[PDB]
């Protein structure tokens, strides 16, 4: 439930971003989410990729720790 999740590299390549954990933490820092708005409800992601993320939030998938472990970072970001 963190940036050090090796699922984030693969999840970002899936969404069309870098697998570099240094770049990954920089993307989510530069573009955070409000604690009311979760990962599949983010207008930052494209509608097909957001509905694809949503599947892991609808039912516990193999991308469960990817999507959950990312969603915590966005909603519990910076100022």
Coordinates of N, CA and C in Angstrom, one line a residue:
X1 N 0.9 -1.2 0.0 CA 0.0 0.0 0.0 C 0.9 1.2 0.0
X2 N 1.8 1.3 -1.0 CA 2.9 2.2 -1.1 C 3.5 2.3 -2.5
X3 N 4.5 3.2 -2.6 CA 5.2 3.5 -3.9 C 6.2 2.3 -4.2
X4 N 6.6 1.6 -3.2 CA 7.6 0.5 -3.3 C 7.0 -0.8 -3.8
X5 N 5.6 -0.8 -4.0 CA 4.9 -1.9 -4.7 C 5.5 -2.1 -6.1
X6 N 6.0 -3.3 -6.4 CA 6.6 -3.7 -7.7 C 5.4 -3.8 -8.7
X7 N 4.2 -3.8 -8.2 CA 3.0 -3.8 -9.1 C 2.8 -2.4 -9.8
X8 N 3.2 -1.3 -9.1 CA 3.1 0.1 -9.7 C 3.9 0.2 -11.0
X9 N 5.2 -0.3 -11.1 CA 5.9 -0.3 -12.5 C 5.0 -0.9 -13.6
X10 N 4.4 -2.1 -13.4 CA 3.6 -2.8 -14.4 C 2.3 -2.1 -14.6
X11 N 1.7 -1.5 -13.5 CA 0.4 -0.8 -13.6 C 0.5 0.5 -14.4
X12 N 1.6 1.2 -14.2 CA 1.9 2.5 -14.9 C 2.1 2.2 -16.4
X13 N 2.9 1.2 -16.8 CA 3.1 0.8 -18.2 C 1.7 0.4 -18.8
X14 N 0.9 -0.2 -18.0 CA -0.5 -0.5 -18.4 C -1.3 0.7 -18.8
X15 N -1.1 1.8 -17.9 CA -1.8 3.1 -18.1 C -1.1 4.0 -19.1
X16 N 0.1 3.7 -19.5 CA 0.9 4.4 -20.5 C 1.9 5.5 -19.8
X17 N 2.5 5.1 -18.7 CA 3.5 5.9 -17.9 C 4.8 5.1 -17.7
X18 N 5.8 5.7 -17.0 CA 7.1 5.0 -16.8 C 7.0 4.0 -15.6
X19 N 7.8 3.0 -15.7 CA 8.0 1.9 -14.6 C 9.1 2.3 -13.6
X20 N 9.7 3.4 -13.8 CA 10.8 3.9 -13.0 C 10.1 4.4 -11.7
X21 N 10.3 3.8 -10.5 CA 9.7 4.1 -9.2 C 10.0 5.6 -8.7
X22 N 11.1 6.2 -9.2 CA 11.5 7.6 -9.0 C 10.5 8.5 -9.8
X23 N 10.2 8.1 -11.0 CA 9.3 8.8 -11.9 C 7.9 8.6 -11.5
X24 N 7.6 7.4 -11.0 CA 6.2 7.0 -10.6 C 5.7 7.9 -9.4
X25 N 6.6 8.0 -8.4 CA 6.3 8.8 -7.2 C 6.2 10.3 -7.5
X26 N 7.0 10.7 -8.6 CA 7.0 12.1 -9.1 C 5.7 12.4 -9.9
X27 N 5.1 11.4 -10.6 CA 3.8 11.6 -11.3 C 2.6 11.8 -10.4
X28 N 2.5 10.9 -9.4 CA 1.4 10.9 -8.4 C 1.5 12.1 -7.4
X29 N 2.8 12.6 -7.2 CA 3.0 13.8 -6.4 C 2.6 15.1 -7.2
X30 N 3.0 15.1 -8.5 CA 2.7 16.3 -9.3 C 1.2 16.3 -9.7
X31 N 0.5 15.2 -9.6 CA -0.9 15.1 -9.9 C -1.6 14.2 -8.9
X32 N -1.9 14.7 -7.6 CA -2.6 14.0 -6.6 C -4.1 13.9 -6.8
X33 N -4.9 13.3 -5.9 CA -6.3 13.2 -5.9 C -6.9 13.7 -4.5
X34 N -8.1 14.2 -4.5 CA -8.8 14.5 -3.2 C -9.2 13.2 -2.5
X35 N -9.2 13.2 -1.1 CA -9.6 11.9 -0.3 C -11.1 11.5 -0.5
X36 N -11.9 12.3 -1.3 CA -13.3 12.0 -1.7 C -13.3 11.2 -3.0
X37 N -12.3 11.5 -3.9 CA -12.2 11.0 -5.3 C -11.2 9.9 -5.3
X38 N -11.6 8.6 -5.5 CA -10.7 7.4 -5.6 C -10.0 7.3 -7.0
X39 N -9.2 6.3 -7.2 CA -8.4 6.0 -8.4 C -9.2 5.9 -9.7
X40 N -10.3 5.0 -9.8 CA -11.1 4.8 -11.0 C -12.1 6.0 -11.3
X41 N -12.3 6.9 -10.3 CA -13.1 8.1 -10.4 C -12.3 9.3 -10.7
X42 N -11.0 9.1 -10.9 CA -10.0 10.2 -11.2 C -10.2 10.6 -12.7
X43 N -10.4 11.9 -13.0 CA -10.5 12.4 -14.4 C -9.1 12.5 -15.0
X44 N -8.0 12.2 -14.2 CA -6.6 12.2 -14.7 C -6.4 11.0 -15.6
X45 N -7.1 9.8 -15.4 CA -7.0 8.6 -16.2 C -8.1 8.7 -17.3
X46 N -7.8 8.1 -18.5 CA -8.7 8.0 -19.6 C -9.9 7.0 -19.3
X47 N -11.1 7.3 -19.8 CA -12.4 6.5 -19.4 C -12.3 5.0 -19.5
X48 N -11.6 4.5 -20.5 CA -11.4 3.0 -20.7 C -10.4 2.5 -19.6
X49 N -9.3 3.2 -19.4 CA -8.3 2.8 -18.4 C -8.8 3.0 -17.0
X50 N -9.7 3.9 -16.8 CA -10.4 4.2 -15.5 C -11.4 3.1 -15.1
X51 N -12.1 2.7 -16.1 CA -13.1 1.5 -16.0 C -12.3 0.2 -15.9
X52 N -11.1 0.1 -16.4 CA -10.2 -1.0 -16.3 C -9.7 -1.2 -14.9
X53 N -9.2 0.0 -14.3 CA -8.8 0.1 -12.9 C -10.0 -0.3 -12.0
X54 N -11.2 0.2 -12.4 CA -12.4 0.0 -11.6 C -12.7 -1.5 -11.3
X55 N -12.4 -2.4 -12.3 CA -12.6 -3.8 -12.1 C -11.9 -4.4 -10.9
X56 N -10.7 -3.9 -10.6 CA -9.9 -4.3 -9.4 C -10.5 -3.7 -8.1
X57 N -11.2 -2.6 -8.2 CA -11.9 -2.0 -7.1 C -13.4 -2.6 -6.9
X58 N -13.9 -3.2 -8.0 CA -15.3 -3.8 -7.9 C -15.2 -5.2 -7.3
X59 N -14.2 -6.0 -7.7 CA -13.9 -7.3 -7.2 C -12.4 -7.4 -7.0
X60 N -11.9 -8.1 -6.0 CA -10.5 -8.3 -5.7 C -9.8 -9.1 -6.8
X61 N -9.0 -8.4 -7.6 CA -8.3 -8.9 -8.8 C -6.8 -9.2 -8.5
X62 N -6.0 -9.5 -9.5 CA -4.6 -9.7 -9.4 C -3.9 -8.3 -9.3
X63 N -4.6 -7.2 -9.8 CA -4.2 -5.8 -9.7 C -4.8 -5.1 -8.5
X64 N -5.2 -6.0 -7.5 CA -5.9 -5.4 -6.3 C -4.9 -4.6 -5.5
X65 N -3.7 -5.1 -5.2 CA -2.6 -4.3 -4.5 C -2.0 -3.2 -5.4
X66 N -2.1 -3.4 -6.7 CA -1.7 -2.3 -7.6 C -2.6 -1.1 -7.5
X67 N -3.9 -1.3 -7.6 CA -4.9 -0.3 -7.6 C -5.1 0.4 -6.2
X68 N -5.2 -0.5 -5.2 CA -5.3 -0.1 -3.8 C -4.1 0.6 -3.3
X69 N -2.9 0.0 -3.6 CA -1.6 0.5 -3.2 C -1.2 1.8 -3.9
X70 N -1.9 2.1 -5.1 CA -1.7 3.4 -5.8 C -2.7 4.4 -5.2
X71 N -4.0 4.0 -5.0 CA -5.1 4.9 -4.7 C -4.9 5.6 -3.3
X72 N -4.2 4.9 -2.4 CA -3.9 5.4 -1.1 C -2.9 6.6 -1.2
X73 N -1.9 6.5 -2.2 CA -0.9 7.5 -2.4 C -1.4 8.8 -3.0
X74 N -2.4 8.7 -3.9 CA -3.0 9.8 -4.6 C -3.9 10.6 -3.6
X75 N -4.8 9.9 -2.9 CA -5.8 10.5 -1.9 C -5.1 10.9 -0.6
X76 N -4.0 10.3 -0.3 CA -3.2 10.7 0.9 C -1.8 11.2 0.4
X77 N -1.9 12.2 -0.5 CA -0.7 12.8 -1.2 C -0.1 13.8 -0.3
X78 N 0.1 15.0 -0.9 CA 0.7 16.2 -0.2 C -0.4 17.2 0.1
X79 N 0.0 18.5 0.3 CA -0.9 19.6 0.5 C -1.8 19.8 -0.8

